[PDB]
Design a protein around this ligand. Sequence first.
Ligand SMILES: Cc1ncc(COP(=O)(O)O)c(CNCCCC(=O)O)c1O
Ligand SMILES: Cc1ncc(COP(=O)(O)O)c(CNCCCC(=O)O)c1O
Lengths: 360, 360
Amino acid sequence: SDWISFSHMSSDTDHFPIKSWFRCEQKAASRSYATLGDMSHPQGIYEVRAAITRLISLTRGVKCRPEQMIIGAGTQVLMQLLTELLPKEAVYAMEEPGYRRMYQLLKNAGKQVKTIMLDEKGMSIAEITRQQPDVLVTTPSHQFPSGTIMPVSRRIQLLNWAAEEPARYIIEDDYDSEFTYDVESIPALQSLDRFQNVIYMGTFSKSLLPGLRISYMVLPPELLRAYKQRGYDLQTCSSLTQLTLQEFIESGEYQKHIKKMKQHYKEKRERLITALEAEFSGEVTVKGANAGLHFVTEFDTRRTEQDILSHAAGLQLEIFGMSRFNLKTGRPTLIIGFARLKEEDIQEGVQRLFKAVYGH
Amino acid sequence: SDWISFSHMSSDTDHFPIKSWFRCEQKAASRSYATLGDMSHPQGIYEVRAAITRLISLTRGVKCRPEQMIIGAGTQVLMQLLTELLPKEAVYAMEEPGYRRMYQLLKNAGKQVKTIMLDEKGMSIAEITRQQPDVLVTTPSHQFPSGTIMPVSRRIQLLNWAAEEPARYIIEDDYDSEFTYDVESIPALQSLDRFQNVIYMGTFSKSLLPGLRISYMVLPPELLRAYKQRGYDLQTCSSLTQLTLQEFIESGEYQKHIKKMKQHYKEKRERLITALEAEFSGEVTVKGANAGLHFVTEFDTRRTEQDILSHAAGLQLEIFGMSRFNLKTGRPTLIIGFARLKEEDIQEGVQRLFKAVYGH
Ligand SMILES: Cc1ncc(COP(=O)(O)O)c(CNCCCC(=O)O)c1O
Ligand SMILES: Cc1ncc(COP(=O)(O)O)c(CNCCCC(=O)O)c1O
């Protein structure tokens, strides 16, 4: 059980300030103890929404009122809710390759879903123009899984597309947006939007811990009114978790945490890439490593993706292949996550990966 | 802001062992710390499901394997999931009066929903037989909101009905089942079921705190296989909350807690009823007070339910009327919850209620 993790679905625990999180929980609990006997406001505790609002206004430039926000026990429960606010007959469009779980959720809900190939600037506007969908689902900070950072130019083009005819919506999934390495960070589509066509979605799974189960989305005014007319919804995110998060943010512990992890992840990513190129004698192609907590590696080998993956598991290496992200040759590509990866495991993990790819 | 609560949607905080809960969280966290960097198993952490299983086998006689269980960030997210496992065209049947939120969820999902009146033994089997639905939704321990305890005889009758033709399902919502006052507790429908037609649903909102957001449901083998074929679902209940709950149960703190609250709620309910009958000079009818954390009171007054409710709010009394639970004269009826009600507020609250009903 000496497993090494190259997983893209994990967070670091070694440097997570668990004692501070617990201290924040105790403080938040004793301050709002009486409210724990009742359910949360359906959109989430107001003070907590206000704290997330100020945060994402500062870091992503997002423009909204806390009343527009809905928390949030996972992006999927929010997405589920979102599809019930949007027109029932809406045609969705997802990036290809992309998030298969969300693709499956949409298809399972009976929705028509188009897939849009990527170019060097991310989600192809030419393909969007051609296929004429209603609702875009896009990951601009770090394309999931390819890692492409959508430049401002393509962001404008998508925004121009949504604004020119009505009933066009853009779901901006800002997953993995906290960490941009040696490029400046870029404002959210939502921030650049002048016509309120963007639904901004965010999560704390990467910046904190995925098991905390706190996510959020920001609704355009008209979709917010559609939400309010339901009236039966209940909040799914834990009240204690909500209150703790607010204290964590407002006390400066979150900013302290992000500052530390930003440096840590950057140094670890650099060490890992140096180790990969040294072990593979530079016979590897690394893509999508300018932001986020994973990148893509292509190998020059006759071994199939499946057999490499099969051998990796026998080597107790947790790793996934690019075919996981197909919605619909001789260079297998894998996703290399490094969030959970222990610094002390870099060389051992990279050596195991070499044996998985080549057989020795 | 001197509010008194007769709410049925609350839990006691004054006697909740918050320090023990926190001690259990710290212990659970340090024991399973490494797992917090990954997402939970989609059905919930296995050890946590096993702990809930043993608990509900002991207290409700429920018969299942942990593999059948799904957690659980609220009954509504589980119900949502359940309707996607059941036949899409299934005709549901709910108790009338009943849980309007769930009625709205089902209707919003495009489902046909019948309503079934109650008799002295609860959900009428004669009405069920007449209307011929597919899926029953029932609250046997303490009918929501009427408080009627479904006797074993009616439970058998419902079970016989589901077993006699295929594609008949019973959703057993065992909300408010922890506390039965001066009657013996009764085994769940699920426990008496010989044909695997029951979906058992439970929550910790009443026995712990509603803001913890942990609920669960137990699926019949065939519905479990239907669940497993989706494959894209993610867990919605917090991992820390899950792990804490397991430690809370397995350390004996839960049993200790339930023992204490059982006595506390029983004594408080008795004091409240004595206060009500004294203040209203016995001109009140109390119904559904043999279990659960609320009962029903009918008043002899010309004031409408709405005007009584309107005056109550001006008196800073949190209270709801029976019409809240209509899915589709001269004796207004209110629901009196007492979970959150402070012992020291009984007389002041009962005096405010008298002024709301009568005007002085
Ligand atoms: C594309 C994308 N968007 C959001 C999330 C975060 O979801 P939660 O808010 O934490 O529930 C993620 C989730 N990623 C883990 C699953 C990746 C996989 O390969 O299945 C995401 O990918
Ligand atoms: C009938 C019924 N079943 C289950 C629940 C518990 O739901 P959670 O697991 O806590 O999400 C409840 C919920 N009750 C509070 C709402 C009552 C109302 O008047 O709206 C319930 O009623």
